[PDB]
Structures are given as structure tokens and as C-alpha cells.
Design a protein around this ligand. Structure first.
Ligand code: HEM
Ligand code: HEM
Ligand SMILES: C[C@H](O)[C@H](O)[C@H]1CNc2nc(N)[nH]c(=O)c2N1
Ligand SMILES: C[C@H](O)[C@H](O)[C@H]1CNc2nc(N)[nH]c(=O)c2N1
Ligand SMILES: NC(=[NH2+])NCCC[C@H](N)C(=O)O
Ligand SMILES: NC(=[NH2+])NCCC[C@H](N)C(=O)O
Ligand SMILES: [Zn+2]
Lengths: 420, 420
């Protein structure tokens, strides 16, 4: 079946066939399309109370092994059979199986390549995998994480990496990081009702306070690492401030921008997602890349539910903040995003503008169809939050579907935890 | 059954129940979502060569009548019941029916209310209907269209209106305007490969030329109205220039913008669409509203597949047109959109900025849920192509579905029509 995909900007046409190997878990039906649901149950992998029944695990395990060995330009016929045989045994004798070191590396990279919402996928093959499946205590998790942070930060020359903690066995012995990101700022609900800091982390900040963390009521306070070792209650750890690289915001023209006293961290490390590989689940697998300007400038800074600094900037710029039609909102957002890119560049830290990112993704998408004839793509997430149609991804028709390996969301640990 | 959708910017939630009455025709499967396809077959409504079977039409006819009488605040028990039998009898005898003049008024306004891609639906219950089902000749159609244009243009103060041509019967006697829009610039393919004018009209203009139209090889050449009556062959008609209101483009601060010598028509009138009312189809039904700034500024002017003035303006502003990270494209887009709004305000022509548009639609969507417990919406088309996340529609989760009445696309006439 050849579902024809077309790019109305360049006339480029694609034939998607890969969508057949997809897992039919999406909620979209013939009567209604719900592609705009942010965090659907379909892309979520809930917690369990008992291991995956060997009956549904086996076919998935083999399916993965086939894909792994099939990825080789060569033909390893023997090793392939030996492994598929070895795994089948392990599942029938232990109820689960372990991935080899190389299979894990292929798994993580392939899952990235399968992330329909990631726009930096042109780098899918360039990832540093840290094996921490041997981990056993929260204290060790902290050390593994600091290793990751020290690496990926790399004195400003950010580089992608991922740390894989021991897979899910019972579902009662989960190894996971509660924090949405390794590095994130605190959010505090102030007495006057307003929120000081990042609104997105108000709830998680409370959890940190309940666990003992002392609030500092600042706008950019780095939240402590809330780590969980095999089902045990989580323990707090403070990322040494030396490892947290930040960039102070400033404009190449508006010297008053410094007055806003803004800043942001350099490392975007999502930490609460789950890696699914041939039936196995890794609830603890923090990964990172480098930032795309708009993520901070448009979203983190101008969302009403985030720092919301838009009006303050429009006023400082002396724009008509009352006449909407003045397009004051659009100028402000642009100057803010310039401040971001500028600041990261003046401080020798890796950042990527949304134009360069988009053009690189087109190159990537093309490679996908030429190689494996398919590319899972969520238009709603790939198109930048500012100047949408000015980028080629806006003009690209795309199919969104779930494959395997894959990075699923999770129900934030605390909401389902069984405290002791 | 309730499907919950939330707006992450305001926190507000809605419970959609209206999606149950949707016609299951969307191509989104459980395995893959194709909501990013521009003009899918599901939203298209092809040609016929055999009338709609009365067997098949009766349900749809009754359904509309009930929906019609259901709109009234009172109760018209008597007239309702009478109309139901009158229609049943009429379809039984003739094999089709004729909606009353007032029903046509309701249908057009309702189909607008049911257009999931229109962001200006807040104006739904405000439309001027021109009943032209009595029409019989191409010449007549032209006379009707000229009425619509004069009425809607209203010397600057734009007004919404729709002109309904005779309903399809055999499917061999269609009455329709082949033009994508009433007023639209031509596009020529110059001898050096390049394109002069609007690229999106190359094929259409070529047709006009084939039909004896003299290419004026200019940039903003208003292409002739290609009308079709009773399924005959189309006849050319040049819309009287005095009726075509244009707006000269100029910036409030950039004196040199005038030198760009740009302009655009004030009347956005989609002609090539099909209105479906209770099983009946009208291949001819031009409609219009007023422009939203971004349609001209972001799309028509900046698209690579359109006028593509982006680089010219950038160089004109003296921006680093070679360093993407300078965000010159974004600054250029903003000023171009500021020029569009300014030009219209100056010439006293009606236009709406995407910010006022989105905030008005936010109110419309809330009312729809209060009213019918639903509001079909295509996120991908509703979020402005500029500063997406700065508008509330960006943060609004939504369901997209086909109701009735509705405005469907069609297969471009020349692409199917059999020439006499
Ligand atoms: C090379 C740098 C990278 C860039 C520039 C990039 C950029 C992006 C962007 C712009 C998003 C949207 C996030 C949001 O709007 O909240 C995204 C999402 C995502 N990316 Fe990447 N990415 C990079 C690296 C990675 C890596 C290394 C992985 C995984 C191994 C990855 C996995 C994903 C996933 C799964 C999402 C979805 C996050 C969510 O749903 O909240 N990305 N990426
Ligand atoms: C009050 C003024 C109106 C505004 C501000 C408005 C605005 C819009 C916008 C921005 C679009 C997208 C245009 C594009 O990207 O091609 C649109 C689409 C649409 N509007 Fe409205 N609209 C208005 C009136 C109308 C009227 C009067 C009708 C019908 C009677 C209507 C029916 C639709 C439909 C069917 C679409 C889809 C067009 C397509 O798919 O090509 N709109 N409208
Ligand atoms: C409602 C809608 O799904 C939601 O606002 C989405 C839109 N697109 C997005 N795209 C990205 N990259 N990130 C987001 O958080 C969102 N939010
Ligand atoms: C590929 C994608 O569907 C296409 O570029 C869409 C995106 N959103 C749009 N939205 C509007 N209003 N109009 C368009 O023409 C488009 N183009
Ligand atoms: N490029 C990335 N790795 N992005 C990961 C998500 C970062 C998130 N959007 C933030 O603003 O903090
Ligand atoms: N506001 C409207 N009625 N828009 C209808 C579509 C007009 C089309 N987007 C154009 O730029 O020509
Ligand atoms: Zn869908």
C-alpha cells in the first residue's frame, strides 16, 4: 500500500509503506481525528504489577532480533539463528531476556529515529549510550547521571547521550527518574496567588518540598534530582552546581534586556520517558540533545503557562501593547528569540535555530524514505512555534505512527506510587 | 460517551459529544494518523454521472429537516411534520427535493459553522445568501457573481456572502465556477523557466489561455472568471476592473516598501467548493468573508510556491540574509505582515489580524460546546502560520470531524470534464 505524501513547497513526493509495520494503538477513527491531543493514552506506557506474560513477549523479542540482525548491511545468518534461539530459551526459562550491549545501542538509536515528534532526528545515528543496567541503588543512579551530565555538557559543546537503567521486571521494582528533565527550574505558588519560577514544575516542586528539599523562592532554582531504585521510595540528590551550565540572556541591541535578569540551562535532558525494546520496558532512560532556540524563546519564555515575559518585553520595546493589530506580540517574540540565539553564541554554547533544524529534518526525512521507505512524523510537533510556514516542514504532508523500538511517555511516578 | 479536550494555556476543558453525529469518512486508521494531508479524498466530493439514489437520499433529507426545525427557539410542530411528509412524497415522486429558500439560508450558515478549517466561524450566523438556483446560463452566472462582488466589496467595508447556484442532478449538468477564487492573479511560465505572477495559478491560467484568453504577462493580472452552466462547456468572462478592489502595499516606517510595488485584492472569495445539504450537492456556491492578515502576508507573499518576496525584503532591511541564526526571515515576515495590516487600515479596507482572529475563535469554540457540545476543528489549519504558540488556538486540543451540512472540496473541473 503506497500512501502518497507530498511537499507543497518543493513538489517533493514520497510513498510511505512503513506504516504497515506500525502498532495499531492510535485513537484516531474514521469518525474523528484526535491528532492534537498532547499526551494521549496511546503514546503512554502505564506501570504494571507483574511481568509481561512470556506468551506476548516472545513474538516481540524475536521481532526485535530480526530487525537488529536485519540492520546489518552484511548477513550473519549463523549468529542471527543462535541468538533468536538463545533468546527464546531465556524467555521460556526466566520469563524475560537481556539485550546484548550492541543491541542496546541499536535500540536507543532506532527509538530516536522512530520518535515522530523529534525534529533533530538527522543525528539519530550519533548518540552516546551509557550502560547503567547494572545499577542497583539510588546513590549509584545519581553518579551515573552526573557522568551523563558532565559528558553531554562538554564545556558548552553539547553532545547527545542517553543512560539506560535496568529494565522493568515486576513493575514493582522500577528504576526511574521522577524529574521531567535532569535539569529544570522550580515553580512556587506564592501567597498573592501568582507563581514565582517555572509554572510547569509547581507540582513537582511541592513533591520536593514534602521530601525535605528547602525552597529558595527564586525564579531559576534548580530542582533536586528525585531518584528511584527498584520500587523503593525516591531519594533526593542535588546536582553539583558546577555541572549545571547556564546562559544569561542578553540582546545584541537592547541593553535593557539584561535588566530582565533572565537565563536558562544549556542541557535539554528529558528524563521521565520509557524505552520499549522488543517487549522490554526501560522506565529509567534519560536522554539529551542540544536546544533549538524556539524551545526556550517561544515556549519556555513566552507561554502564558510558563515564564510569560512577553508583555514586559513589548513595553520595554515601547510597542503598542494594547493595539493587538500592531503585531507587537510578533516583534517581541522575535527579539526574544534573537536574544536567546545571540546569548548562546556569545557564550560559546551549542544552540540551533529553528530554520536550520527544519532544513536538516527535510534532509533526514528524505533519507528515511530512500532507505526504509517511511518516516513517522507528527506535523503538530515538528512545525516550530514561530514562523511556521516559513519552514519547509510546514509544507510537508506526513504520516504519524508508532513503531518499535519507541519512546513512550509515562504517568508521572508520584501520582501512582505506593509509598512506604 | 464523552471525549475530553483541554487548553493547556488556560486550563479550560471541554467534553465533546458531537463527534458521534459525524460521517465516518476520515482516512485516519488505528495504525496511522494522516491529519496533515492537505486535500484528502475524505474531504473531497467527486463528480457523478447518475443521480443520487432516492433510496439513499431520504434519510439525509429527513435528518436535515429535523435539524432545520430544531434550530428554531419556538416549536413549529405543525409545519415541521408537514414539511417532513412533503419531502418524503417529493423524493418518492421526483427522486429528489427542493429545500425552501429559508432552509437554504440555514444550510449555508450551518455548513460554515461546520467548517473545521475556518478560524472566523464566530461570524457564522451572519451571512448574506444569494439564491440563484433559478439560474440557467453562464452569462446569468456572471451577472450573479458581479452582484455578489459589488455587495460584498461594499466599497471597503467587506461583508460575508454566498451565492448558491443550482443543485447537481445528473452530475452531467453541473453549474460551477472552475476558478479557485473569483478574484485571483494569474501566473505565467516565462520562456526562461521562471514564473511571473502567482505560481499557484499557472495551470488555471494556462487553461484560460487555451480558451482564448490573452496573457497580459504581468504580475498582478486578474485572471478571467471561467463559468460553467448546465454541464455545458465553460465560457470566459472578465470581471469588470471597477468591481475588483485592490490594496496598494506600503510599510508605516519603511518608505522603500512602496518600491516593491506590491498589492493584493481585498475580497477572499472561494469559488471551487461544494456545499452538501441533506444529501443534496451544489457544485456552484461561491462564498466570501474578509481576509486575515497572515493569509496575504505570510502565505501569498512569502511562500516559495507563491510570490516569495522574503529574500528581497530581507536584503532591503539590511539583514544578514546569509546567516539563518540571525532570524532575518522572522523579522522580514513580521514587517511584511505589518505592511499588509497597515495598507488595509489606510485604504479603509476590512482585514483581521491573526491575534484578534484566534481570540475570537476561542470564544466561538466555547459557545459551540455550551450549545451543541462540540466544535469540529482542524488544529493544523487553525493555528496561524506565524507566531503559532503566541495564539491560544495553539494550546487548544481539538477533534476534527465531518458533519452535515458541510463544505467539501472537489476535483478541479478541467481535470475531469468531457469537452463537447
Ligand atoms: C540533537 C539534538 C536534538 C534536537 C535539536 C532535538 C529537538 C527536538 C524538539 C524541538 C523536540 C520538541 C520538544 C518539545 O517541544 O517539548 C523534540 C522532541 C523529542 N525528541 Fe529530540 N532533539 C534532539 C535530540 C534528541 C535525542 C538525543 C533524543 C532521544 C534519544 C530525542 C528524542 C525526542 C523525543 C522522544 C521527543 C519527544 C519529547 C516529548 O514528547 O515531550 N531528541 N526533539
Ligand atoms: C468572517 C471572515 C472569515 C474569516 C476571518 C475566515 C478566515 C478563514 C481562514 C484564515 C481560513 C484559511 C484560509 C487558507 O489558509 O486557505 C478559512 C478557511 C475556510 N473558511 Fe473561513 N473565514 C471567514 C469567512 C468564511 C465564510 C463566510 C465561509 C463560508 C460561508 C468560510 C468558510 C471557510 C472554509 C470552507 C474554509 C476552508 C477553505 C479551504 O479549505 O480552502 N469562511 N477561513
Ligand atoms: C494542543 C496541542 O497538541 C499542543 O498545544 C501542542 C502543539 N504542538 C506542540 N509542539 C511541540 N513541539 N511541543 C508542544 O508542547 C506542543 N504542544
Ligand atoms: C502539509 C500541510 O497540510 C499544509 O502545509 C497545510 C498546513 N496548514 C495550513 N493551514 C491553512 N490555513 N492553510 C494551508 O494551506 C495550510 N497548509
Ligand atoms: N532538543 C531537545 N532535546 N529538547 C528536549 C525537550 C526540551 C524542552 N522542550 C524544554 O524546553 O526544556
Ligand atoms: N478569509 C477568507 N475568506 N479566506 C479564504 C481563503 C483565501 C486564501 N487563503 C487566499 O489567501 O487567497
Ligand atoms: Zn488522525
Amino acid at each position: 500500500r503506497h500512501v502518497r505524501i507530498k511537499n507543497w513547497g518543493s513538489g517533493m513526493t514520497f510513498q510511505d509503506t512503513l506504516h504497515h509495520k506500525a502498532k495499531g494503538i492510535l485513537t484516531c477513527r474514521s469518525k474523528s481525528c484526535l491528532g492534537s491531543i498532547m499526551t494521549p493514552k496511546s503514546l503512554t506506557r502505564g506501570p504494571r504489577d507483574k511481568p509481561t506474560p512470556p506468551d506476548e513477549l516472545l513474538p516481540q523479542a524475536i521481532e526485535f532480533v530480526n530487525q537488529y540482525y536485519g540492520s546489518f548491511k552484511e548477513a550473519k545468518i549463523e549468529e542471527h539463528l543462535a541468538r533468536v534461539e538463545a533468546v527464546t530459551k531465556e524467555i521460556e526459562t526466566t520469563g524475560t531476556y537481556q539485550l546484548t550491549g550492541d543491541e542496546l545501542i541499536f535500540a536507543t538509536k532506532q527509538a530516536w529515529r522512530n520518535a515522530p515528534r523529534c525534529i533533530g532526528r538527522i543525528q539519530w545515528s550519533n548518540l552516546q549510550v551509557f550502560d547503567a543496567r547494572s545499577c542497583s541503588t539510588a546513590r549509584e543512579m545519581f553518579e551515573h547521571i552526573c557522568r551523563h551530565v558532565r559528558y553531554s555538557t562538554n564545556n558548552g559543546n553539547i553532545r547527545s547521550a542517553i543512560t539506560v537503567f535496568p529494565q522493568r521486571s515486576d513493575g514493582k521494582h522500577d528504576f526511574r527518574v521522577w524529574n521531567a528533565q535532569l535539569i529544570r527550574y522550580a515553580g512556587y505558588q506564592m501567597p498573592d496567588g501568582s507563581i514565582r519560577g517555572d509554572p510547569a514544575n509547581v507540582e513537582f516542586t511541592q513533591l520536593c518540598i514534602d521530601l525535605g528539599w528547602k525552597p529558595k523562592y527564586g525564579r531559576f532554582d534548580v530542582v533536586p534530582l528525585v531518584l528511584q531504585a527498584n520500587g523503593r521510595d525516591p531519594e533526593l540528590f542535588e546536582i553539583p552546581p558546577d555541572l549545571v551550565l547556564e546562559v544569561a540572556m542578553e540582546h545584541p541591541k537592547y541593553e535593557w534586556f539584561r535588566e530582565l535578569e533572565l537565563k536558562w540551562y544549556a542541557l535539554p535532558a528529558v528524563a521521565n520517558m520509557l524505552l520499549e525494546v522488543g517487549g522490554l520496558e526501560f522506565p529509567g532512560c534519560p536522554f539529551n540533545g542540544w536546544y533549538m532556540g524556539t524551545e526556550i524563546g517561544v515556549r519556555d519564555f513566552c507561554d502564558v503557562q510558563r515564564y510569560n515575559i512577553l508583555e514586559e518585553v513589548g513595553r520595554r520595546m515601547g510597542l503598542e501593547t494594547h493595539k493587538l493589530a500592531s503585531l507587537w506580540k510578533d516583534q517581541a517574540v522575535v527579539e526574544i528569540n534573537i536574544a536567546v540565539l545571540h546569548s548562546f553564541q556569545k557564550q560559546n554554547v551549542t544552540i540551533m535555530d529553528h530554520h536550520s533544524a527544519a532544513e536538516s529534518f527535510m534532509k533526514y526525512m528524505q533519507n528515511e524514505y530512500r532507505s526504509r521507505g517511511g518516516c513517522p512524523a507528527d506535523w503538530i510537533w515538528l512545525v516550530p512555534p514561530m514562523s511556521g510556514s516559513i519552514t519547509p516542514v510546514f509544507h510537508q504532508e506526513m504520516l504519524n505512527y508508532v513503531l518499535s523500538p519507541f519512546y513512550y511517555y509515562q504517568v508521572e511516578a508520584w501520582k501512582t506510587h505506593v509509598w512506604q
